[PDB]
């Protein structure tokens, strides 16, 4: 079934994907803290910061990634940022959701001072990943695949990045044939979602303009990773 080295690499990616969590302090606030546009928003900012924290730490561990040129490491990180976050978010919302929590989070998201035109496609996409009751390793691999696009802007050496993404794609494909042997389109169904995930790069870039009214000045990490002002 799975090559000896492919498994050597899949273990390596799991040992980084499963290392990281959303903190107690943060998931409590979803229950604990008071409700309103100000506090609900203020919570979402903390989560988003947490995802960048987690994104980064995942990224640095991806095998090969340290050999990449420093500028290209940055480019990748900022390019993949928004997609990685929508993807972590979904799977925080679909799997690590004591059901009461995820309902309260839905309420809080829908009264965050953010508008439907953004909220609705987010929840759409969640539900869409919902079907394909994705597994632990499916998310870790996609995330690594999303992070290592040769497609992103400002990369010098696309060839080096392509050669890092391709082993991973193989592993995934060979993974679909093992946990979904009855359904041979599965691997495609996945990258189909990976396409509607890139839709969100426009949503995000727009959404910064809309909400930048009322002057937040997000925490330093979101400031730097989203590249605002």
């Amino acid at each position: 079934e799975l090559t000896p080295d492919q498994q050597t690499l899949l273990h390596f990616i799991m040992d980084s994907y499963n290392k990281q969590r959303m903190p107690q302090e943060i998931t409590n606030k979803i229950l604990k803290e008071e409700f309103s546009a100000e506090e609900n928003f203020l919570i979402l900012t903390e989560m988003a910061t947490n995802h960048v924290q987690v994104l980064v730490e995942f990224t640095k561990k991806l095998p090969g990634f340290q050999t990449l040129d420093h500028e290209d490491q940055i480019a990748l990180l900022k390019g993949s940022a928004v997609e990685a976050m929508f993807l972590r978010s979904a799977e925080i919302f679909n799997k690590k959701l004591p059901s009461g929590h995820s309902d309260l989070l839905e309420e809080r998201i829908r009264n965050s001072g953010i508008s439907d035109e953004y909220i609705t496609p987010m929840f759409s996409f969640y539900k869409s990943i919902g079907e394909l009751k994705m597994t632990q390793e499916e998310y870790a691999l996609l995330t690594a695949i999303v992070i290592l696009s040769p497609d992103r802007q400002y990369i010098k050496d696309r060839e080096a990045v392509e050669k890092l993404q391709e082993p991973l794609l193989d592993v995934l494909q060979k993974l679909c044939k093992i946990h979904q042997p009855e359904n041979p389109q599965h691997f495609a169904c996945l990258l189909g979602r990976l396409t509607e995930l890139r839709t969100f790069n426009h949503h995000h870039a727009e959404m910064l303009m809309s909400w930048r009214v009322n002057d937040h000045k997000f925490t330093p990490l979101l400031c730097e990773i989203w590249d605002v002002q």
Binding site: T59, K60, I74
Partner: peptide, 11 residues
């Protein structure tokens, strides 16, 4: 240069 991200990637 992005000091914050270099900082986090090299930690």
């Amino acid at each position: 240069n992005e000091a914050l991200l270099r900082y986090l990637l090299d930690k």
